[PDB]
Design a binder for this molecule. Sequence first.
Ligand code: CLA
Ligand code: CLA
Ligand code: CLA
Ligand code: CLA
Ligand code: LUT
Ligand code: BCR
Ligand code: LMT
Lengths: 39, 219, 213, 84, 311, 227
Amino acid sequence: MKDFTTYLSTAPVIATIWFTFTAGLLIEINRYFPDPLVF
Amino acid sequence: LYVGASQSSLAYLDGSLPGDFGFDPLGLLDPVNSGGFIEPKWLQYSEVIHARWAMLGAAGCIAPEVLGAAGLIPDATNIKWFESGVIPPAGSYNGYWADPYTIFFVEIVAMQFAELRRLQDFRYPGSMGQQYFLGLEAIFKGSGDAAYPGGPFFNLFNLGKTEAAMKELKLKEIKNGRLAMLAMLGYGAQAVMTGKGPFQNLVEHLADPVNNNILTNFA
Amino acid sequence: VRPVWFPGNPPPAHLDGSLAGDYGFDPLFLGQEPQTLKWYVQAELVHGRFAMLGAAGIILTSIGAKVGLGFPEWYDAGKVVVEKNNIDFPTLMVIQFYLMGWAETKRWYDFKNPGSQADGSFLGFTEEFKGLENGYPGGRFFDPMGLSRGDAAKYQEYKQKEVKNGRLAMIACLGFAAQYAATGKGPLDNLADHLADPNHVNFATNGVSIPIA
Amino acid sequence: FIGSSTNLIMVASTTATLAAARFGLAPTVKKNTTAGLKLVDSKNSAGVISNDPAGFTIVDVLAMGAAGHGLGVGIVLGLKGIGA
Amino acid sequence: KVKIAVDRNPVETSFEKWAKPGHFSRTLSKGPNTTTWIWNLHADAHDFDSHTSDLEEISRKVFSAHFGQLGIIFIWLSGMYFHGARFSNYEAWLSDPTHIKPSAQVVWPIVGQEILNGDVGGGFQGIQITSGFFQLWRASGITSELQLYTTAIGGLVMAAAMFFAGWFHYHKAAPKLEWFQNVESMLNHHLGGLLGLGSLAWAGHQIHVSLPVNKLLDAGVDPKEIPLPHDLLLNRAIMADLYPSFAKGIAPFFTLNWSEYSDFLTFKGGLNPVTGGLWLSDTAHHHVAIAVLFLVAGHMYRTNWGIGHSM
Amino acid sequence: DRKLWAPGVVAPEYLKGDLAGDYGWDPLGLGADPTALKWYRQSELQHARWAMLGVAGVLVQEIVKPDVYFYEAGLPQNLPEPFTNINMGGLLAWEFILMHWVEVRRWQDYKNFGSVNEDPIFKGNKVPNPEMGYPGGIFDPFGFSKGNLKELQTKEIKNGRLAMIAYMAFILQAQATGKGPLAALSAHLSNPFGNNILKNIGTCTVPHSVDVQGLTIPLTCLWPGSQ
Ligand code: CLA
Ligand code: CLA
Ligand code: CLA
Ligand code: CLA
Ligand SMILES: CC1=C[C@H](O)CC(C)(C)[C@H]1/C=C/C(C)=C/C=C/C(C)=C/C=C/C=C(C)/C=C/C=C(C)/C=C/C1=C(C)C[C@H](O)CC1(C)C
Ligand SMILES: CC1=C(/C=C/C(C)=C/C=C/C(C)=C/C=C/C=C(C)/C=C/C=C(C)/C=C/C2=C(C)CCCC2(C)C)C(C)(C)CCC1
Ligand SMILES: CCCCCCCCCCCCO[C@@H]1O[C@H](CO)[C@@H](O[C@H]2O[C@H](CO)[C@@H](O)[C@H](O)[C@H]2O)[C@H](O)[C@H]1O
């Protein structure tokens, strides 16, 4: 389990998780606030 | 002994196991570099399990038809084995206390306890005689052999008192099981060909063996 | 020696029979790391204790609905209370997060720092918030009758009953959701139907649990 | 079908193959042909035992049976195809 | 002696190596000091020969890597069958194949991308596919999204089996080098079993399902009223009506009266005028012949008996 | 040593012949645990004595009142005067209260032998209670224990085991035939081949439910037969 969590802490895994989180956040924002051109 | 014997098989087939008639053309019981399910212990145990289920099936699939002919059971029962409900497409009996999926659940829960407890004794010999199981664990100690647990219930009448007598009975169990496993293949092959019952097939082959056989059935 | 979940299979090493309800069940080794195991212990107890209140709430209100006492089904109670009593959903929800937030954060920091909530910081209360064990905060507020501070053996037996009754309630709440989703009726309506026809009214004949049936 | 042209052809074909191997007029599990199309002692691995005097094992029968079947099928369908 | 030979519990199943990048290499296991290490790790990941000089270990890695590939391909196929059952216009296209465009990919409505859901027809909006799956499924005789969904579930069960096989044949029962070096046995099974049996089995599906279903489709019968494949497999009278020779059963096969099966085993050539594709009766007689040819070919190499050839 | 349940069987080590009616018969090994054997022996004594009273009740009642069916005597409308149509609830009240006392007294004797062997009211009144399950004294008002108790314990357990099988015969015969145990014998003797389990089995002659003074009590047979 400790080794498994270390594997989940590897650069590629963290990147996939972090980028999936960031992409999701941006998508959801555009899903609830569509066509945002200006502040 | 039996046709197909090979010098290669004579290496491991020394006649200790029940039904060793020297027949291993594909070299499956060779202990050298063995592993997975291709190993003597699992394969002998599997032949006996298949054999015991096949002996009960060869009788269960041919019993209702015979008894129905003898008039000992109502015609309502007396149904063909493939028409019992195991394969609804081929037919199903609507006179059970519950529907088949309800009875099948009862089967799942029952078999899982029976099979997984039998498995644990093969994996950890003597384990099923330790943890409490309503006092039944007293009869599940088993022996060092998985296919022959024996004990107060599995060997109720203590038959096979001597090593020789038990060896003979083990030879008779494997012989009758191997025959029944072949009968069960016949029952399935003859149900696809004629679409009739195993008993009916025998009755026709006696009523007229020439016009009632596989070569005639092809047409 | 201790009864295990799959008879014949040795218990995992991180499970030594010390914890209440230890039947050596951790097939995915999720509690292999100790500190993680302590967290999951409080998690199972917190989930289980809520499920026990939930199950007892659904069963009583379901009995009152089975009889003619006008108690709404569990899946309809939320709307009845708000509508009949003109209660503002947003206000009730935020009030809950305020109260639960305070109690949960104090329980959280006790886990992070055991005994740290008994300094008198909260209205001068000290001993009622020290905590006896992980997931077992005795004292005079949470154990008002002293059952944990009297007869050590009785305390151990009570802990076994609590975890087992909590795991049963957690299974029962999953059953109340699955049965409502599959049948659309209440839990005691499902029990009456089964009792009436146990061989023809069950999951195998609900038309949903087994799709090929 | 019994005694029919097809039946006779099939029976004779399989019989001829079995006989050829049985009398060393064909390759066997213990007799293998050389590049010069000969017949020398082969070295079967499984080494199935045969009480048969010429050591004709069941594998030899299986092989001859297949060869003979193929021969019979080809002859029957071939004659049918050539009208004969 | 050709035989099954394996080593038991050769490699432990732990995540210890998962947390040690470059464990497979003597140079890479030391860890990274420059960015070149990252590239080297990925570039030398599947070069087993460079990992170890043991052929048996390399062979065991290759075998399990192939089971991993087979599992990947199965997931891919299950997705295609699933998207055909849940995100496609196949059922409408079955009724009107000359006008409705095949589509099996629907996009979510976000950032304006829903424009990609074109008006493909059949009351459906999605991306037009060109993989040819709709025509393959029609040839196979699939007429419902239920059949596509069931095959998708089957493919995932097969993918799980492939990944299991990969783990089992590397960590539990790893075949020894002698096993892999049985080229004569491998060719006999791949020609006779994989190819010949595969072709024979496919002929079975085509004769009992593809030919009657497609004959009814070409006759103009609505896909809803066509008999289900099992109805055709369990009833000979229906198949006999569509193909008179089925009334004779398999007698003609064992009596060498093959000419009787001329109505489903044909040599027409050319193209079916209704669909523009090859005749399925021609594809059926073809796969039956392929099966026979490859069954013979798989009995050429010597194994555990004297008969056969030595490469 | 002693006679066993079968020729060639070896008695379990825990069955050495101490308890009466010991044929070394424990196929499922439920007596291997001493605590369990003690409870199961009490349970066997309870089922034996109750079943012997039941066999005798069904037979005596059948002879005295051959018109009343034992399987349906519990129905209040079939109660003898002046108990006909008596409030069944009130009747269960007496049985629950009385049985609960006697059953908890006997139970406490199991938990602590010789702990409840005295009249809780009129002190001095005490039962000998030589062995658990055998109180004696007021319970043995004729002194038959003062003799060969072990041989009498054998007759009790043997007659009890036979009565337990018989009672279940009466029940199953009642369910398949609809008649009591002497009426069934007569029907058999009337036409042995005509009336027998071969034909009787396959039919449950018991309704699915009965209304007792306003309450529906669900009823079931011991096998899925035509009901
Ligand atoms: C390229 C594929 C492939 C190959 C070459 C092998 C090869 C081998 N396997 Mg293996 N295996 C595979 C795939 C493969 N496997 C898959 C996908 C699984 C997961 C289901 C397994 C699970 C598995 C287990 C659990 C075991 C093996 C074992 C073995 C070894 C000897 C057993 C044997 O195969 O005898 C021949 C196989 C049999 C006698 C059993 C036949 C049962 C099959 C399922 C019946 C039908 C097979 C046929 C292809 C089905 C066609 C379709 C059907 C509708 C007719 C052998 C080296 C055994 C071993 O380790 O020995 C040391 C062993 O224990 N395999
Ligand atoms: C939980 C199950 C499990 C566990 C704990 C292990 C553990 C281990 N395995 Mg292993 N293995 C498994 C399942 C498992 N395996 C299965 C199912 C297979 C069949 C494919 C294999 C086949 C296998 C081989 C052939 C080898 C190992 C090896 C090893 C050891 C080191 C390699 C390693 O794991 O690093 C971790 C490696 C990875 C995380 C890479 C993942 C590979 C996946 C399948 C590729 C997926 C790519 C994706 C589909 C497409 C990407 C496209 C892109 C655009 C995103 C290690 C102790 C190696 C060894 O023995 O040590 C030298 C060895 O050579 N395994
Ligand atoms: C009838 C026998 C048979 C069959 C059908 C196969 C089939 C296959 N073998 Mg193979 N093989 C066999 C015998 C057989 N083998 C024998 C006897 C040996 C020892 C000499 C080998 C040694 C061998 C090696 C070294 C390799 C293969 C590989 C393969 C796969 C190549 C991928 C492909 O093109 O097919 C397409 C794929 C499919 C059609 C999917 C269907 C596959 C199912 C599971 C059919 C079952 C095959 C299996 C042998 C049946 C037994 C399983 C049982 C043990 C549980 C393929 C599925 C390659 C591989 O890695 O596969 C993982 C490979 O490297 N085989
Ligand atoms: C893989 C290829 C394949 C398969 C699977 C089938 C399968 C089938 N064909 Mg077919 N066929 C094929 C290729 C194939 N065919 C080819 C290539 C041709 C061209 C020559 C034909 C031409 C053809 C014709 C003309 C006909 C068939 C027919 C049939 C059906 C009946 C078979 C029969 O009569 O008895 C065959 C005997 C058996 C299948 C043996 C059965 C053994 C059983 C399954 C074993 C069970 C054992 C087990 C232990 C039992 C216990 C069960 C458990 C619950 C306890 C059958 C479903 C007939 C039909 O359509 O019927 C309507 C028919 O008329 N076929
Ligand atoms: C030896 C050898 C050697 C070499 O080396 C190789 C080889 C050759 C491979 C090997 C082998 C061979 C063989 C032959 C095998 C076979 C098997 C079988 C047949 C089985 C069966 C098997 C069979 C079986 C189990 C059966 C079973 C059955 C049962 C239980 C039951 C059933 C039933 C009944 C009653 C009735 C109903 O109504 C229905 C049912 C439900 C259905
Ligand atoms: C003299 C003698 C003997 C006898 C023996 C015998 C009797 C033998 C024979 C045997 C036999 C009787 C054999 C045969 C076999 C056959 C087979 C084995 C066949 C097979 C078939 C096949 C393989 C086919 C194939 C195919 C198809 C299916 C399709 C198309 C065509 C073809 C051909 C390709 C004895 C013992 C008495 C001893 C003493 C002396
Ligand atoms: C050789 C083994 C490997 C291939 C196995 C193929 C079969 C697998 C089992 C499922 C199919 C069973 O085979 C099934 O047999 C019945 C027998 O009544 C056939 O039934 C057919 O022949 C019977 C006579 O025998 C006719 O009365 C019936 O009208 C006709 O449809 C089904 O059409 C066929 O589908």
